[PDB]
Scaffold this motif. Structure first.
Motif, PDB file in Angstrom:
ATOM      1  N   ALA A   1       0.588  -1.237   0.100  1.00 28.71           N
ATOM      2  CA  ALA A   1       0.089   0.052  -0.001  1.00 28.71           C
ATOM      3  C   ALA A   1       0.923   1.271  -0.060  1.00 28.71           C
ATOM      4  O   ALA A   1       0.679   2.061  -0.818  1.00 28.71           O
ATOM      5  CB  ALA A   1      -0.894   0.048   1.146  1.00 28.71           C
ATOM      6  N   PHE A   2       1.822   1.345   1.146  1.00 24.82           N
ATOM      7  CA  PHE A   2       2.709   2.601   0.998  1.00 24.82           C
ATOM      8  C   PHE A   2       4.088   2.158   1.333  1.00 24.82           C
ATOM      9  O   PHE A   2       5.023   2.900   0.877  1.00 24.82           O
ATOM     10  CB  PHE A   2       2.279   3.516   2.237  1.00 24.82           C
ATOM     11  CG  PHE A   2       0.811   3.922   2.117  1.00 24.82           C
ATOM     12  CD1 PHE A   2       0.592   5.049   1.311  1.00 24.82           C
ATOM     13  CD2 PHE A   2      -0.219   3.247   2.849  1.00 24.82           C
ATOM     14  CE1 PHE A   2      -0.868   5.547   1.164  1.00 24.82           C
ATOM     15  CE2 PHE A   2      -1.533   3.761   2.575  1.00 24.82           C
ATOM     16  CZ  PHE A   2      -1.722   4.931   1.949  1.00 24.82           C
ATOM     17  N   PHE A   3       4.339   0.620   1.787  1.00 21.48           N
ATOM     18  CA  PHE A   3       5.723   0.233   2.004  1.00 21.48           C
ATOM     19  C   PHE A   3       5.840  -0.805   1.045  1.00 21.48           C
ATOM     20  O   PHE A   3       5.164  -1.491   1.245  1.00 21.48           O
ATOM     21  CB  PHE A   3       6.035  -0.256   3.416  1.00 21.48           C
ATOM     22  CG  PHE A   3       6.174   0.875   4.413  1.00 21.48           C
ATOM     23  CD1 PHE A   3       4.724   1.335   5.024  1.00 21.48           C
ATOM     24  CD2 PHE A   3       7.205   1.400   5.021  1.00 21.48           C
ATOM     25  CE1 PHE A   3       4.793   2.187   5.963  1.00 21.48           C
ATOM     26  CE2 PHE A   3       7.146   2.442   6.033  1.00 21.48           C
ATOM     27  CZ  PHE A   3       5.960   2.711   6.547  1.00 21.48           C
ATOM     28  N   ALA A   4       5.253  -4.334  -2.700  1.00 20.23           N
ATOM     29  CA  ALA A   4       5.649  -3.232  -3.633  1.00 20.23           C
ATOM     30  C   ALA A   4       5.780  -3.687  -5.185  1.00 20.23           C
ATOM     31  O   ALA A   4       7.015  -4.036  -5.499  1.00 20.23           O
ATOM     32  CB  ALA A   4       6.730  -2.542  -3.404  1.00 20.23           C
TER      33      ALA A   4
ATOM     34  N   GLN B  17       7.864   3.778  -0.483  1.00 22.75           N
ATOM     35  CA  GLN B  17       6.943   3.931  -1.507  1.00 22.75           C
ATOM     36  C   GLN B  17       6.216   2.613  -1.801  1.00 22.75           C
ATOM     37  O   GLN B  17       6.759   1.399  -2.041  1.00 22.75           O
ATOM     38  CB  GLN B  17       7.986   4.412  -2.740  1.00 22.75           C
ATOM     39  CG  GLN B  17       9.086   3.551  -3.013  1.00 22.75           C
ATOM     40  CD  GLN B  17      10.086   3.866  -4.188  1.00 22.75           C
ATOM     41  OE1 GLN B  17       9.898   5.226  -4.530  1.00 22.75           O
ATOM     42  NE2 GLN B  17      11.157   3.401  -4.364  1.00 22.75           N
ATOM     43  N   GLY B  18       5.110   2.798  -2.297  1.00 22.84           N
ATOM     44  CA  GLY B  18       4.179   1.780  -2.538  1.00 22.84           C
ATOM     45  C   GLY B  18       3.476   1.706  -3.707  1.00 22.84           C
ATOM     46  O   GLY B  18       3.424   2.680  -4.736  1.00 22.84           O
ATOM     47  N   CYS B  19       2.652   0.560  -4.210  1.00 20.73           N
ATOM     48  CA  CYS B  19       1.795   0.392  -5.243  1.00 20.73           C
ATOM     49  C   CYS B  19       0.722   1.786  -5.550  1.00 20.73           C
ATOM     50  O   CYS B  19       0.643   2.235  -6.459  1.00 20.73           O
ATOM     51  CB  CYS B  19       1.128  -0.816  -5.381  1.00 20.73           C
ATOM     52  SG  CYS B  19       2.037  -2.221  -5.651  1.00 20.73           S
ATOM     53  N   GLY B  21       1.027   4.495  -3.217  1.00 20.83           N
ATOM     54  CA  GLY B  21       1.418   5.539  -2.490  1.00 20.83           C
ATOM     55  C   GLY B  21       2.623   5.505  -2.006  1.00 20.83           C
ATOM     56  O   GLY B  21       3.439   4.533  -2.193  1.00 20.83           O
TER      57      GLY B  21
END
Lengths: 4, 275
Positions: A1-3, A4, B17-19, B21
């Motif tokens: 989500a934020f950390f 692919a 950093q992500g998918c 966001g």
């Protein structure tokens, strides 16, 4: 989500 | 109403950093250290986010990362309490991971279960419970984050539970085929989360690919007991991985089990090189  | 101005936020260092966001350490007014998560435009509708953010405001627990403020306008900003050690996946794969042993990991597992148990009591569903969405702070404190944002995602592949932007490996079969997401489906993800802990951050179903997993799981394949992991913990994983959701354990049971693990379950434990 934020950390692919 | 809990909306805030963008100029109030300063993004100092990029944690990840992500998918959909990225996440930043930052200051909320020059006084308050905060974590800022930013979503790429077209990820989710701002009205839908605000409607959901109302529910997120309702959810308060010491093992849940607490929402501070939001910016509705794209790119959407989510402002929450800062966690010093970053992601659980980051932490396990980090330098500290070598010093982590089974008591630490089970304790970390217990805290996650405690937060989810509250979510279980609140009749809420996380929809994406894994190490990536766990946040670690000082003194081995673990808190659950990013609850409720999985539903809001507008990505076409993601909606069909497909396309490798989707965490199929953590996803229960009934929630993968038919998209039926419950607290029970979260329990399945938690069992997979347990694998991440006892392997210190290894990807689930190693060597298998996202396409391969669902058929394998459907035909009864389950992940084996990890090295130096007590069979009793692995049995807990299997309970989480039962085909019938109803027979999977509750988060309340999980929290008590993990909390009492070394007195009630494995009193004769000895530390090893890894666990």
């Amino acid at each position: 989500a934020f950390f692919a | 109403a809990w909306e805030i101005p963008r100029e109030s936020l300063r993004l100092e260092v990029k944690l990840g950093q992500g998918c959909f966001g990225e996440v930043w350490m930052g200051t909320w007014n020059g006084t308050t250290r905060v974590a800022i998560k930013t979503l790429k435009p077209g990820t989710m509708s701002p009205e839908a986010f605000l409607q959901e953010a109302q529910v997120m405001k309702k959810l308060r627990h010491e093992k849940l990362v607490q929402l501070y403020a939001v910016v509705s306008e794209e790119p959407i900003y989510i402002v929450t309490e800062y966690m010093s050690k970053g992601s659980l996946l980051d932490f396990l794969k980090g330098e500290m991971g070598k010093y982590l042993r089974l008591p630490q990991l089970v304790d970390m597992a217990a805290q996650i279960a405690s937060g989810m148990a509250y979510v279980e009591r609140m009749n809420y569903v996380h929809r994406d419970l894994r190490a990536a969405n766990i946040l670690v702070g000082e003194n081995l404190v673990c808190k659950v984050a990013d609850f409720g944002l999985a539903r809001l995602i507008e990505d076409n592949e993601y909606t069909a539970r497909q396309g490798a932007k989707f965490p199929i490996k953590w996803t229960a079969p009934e929630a993968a085929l038919y998209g039926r997401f419950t607290i029970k489906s979260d329990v399945w993800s938690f069992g997979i989360l347990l694998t991440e802990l006892t392997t210190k951050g290894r990807v689930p179903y190693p060597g298998m690919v996202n396409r391969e997993v669902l058929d394998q799981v459907e035909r009864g394949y389950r992940m084996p007991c990890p090295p130096e992991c007590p069979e009793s913990l692995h049995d807990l994983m299997c309970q989480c991985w039962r085909k019938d959701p109803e027979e999977r354990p509750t988060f309340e049971y999980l929290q008590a089990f993990l909390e009492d693990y070394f007195t009630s379950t494995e009193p004769q434990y000895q530390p090893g090189e890894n666990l």
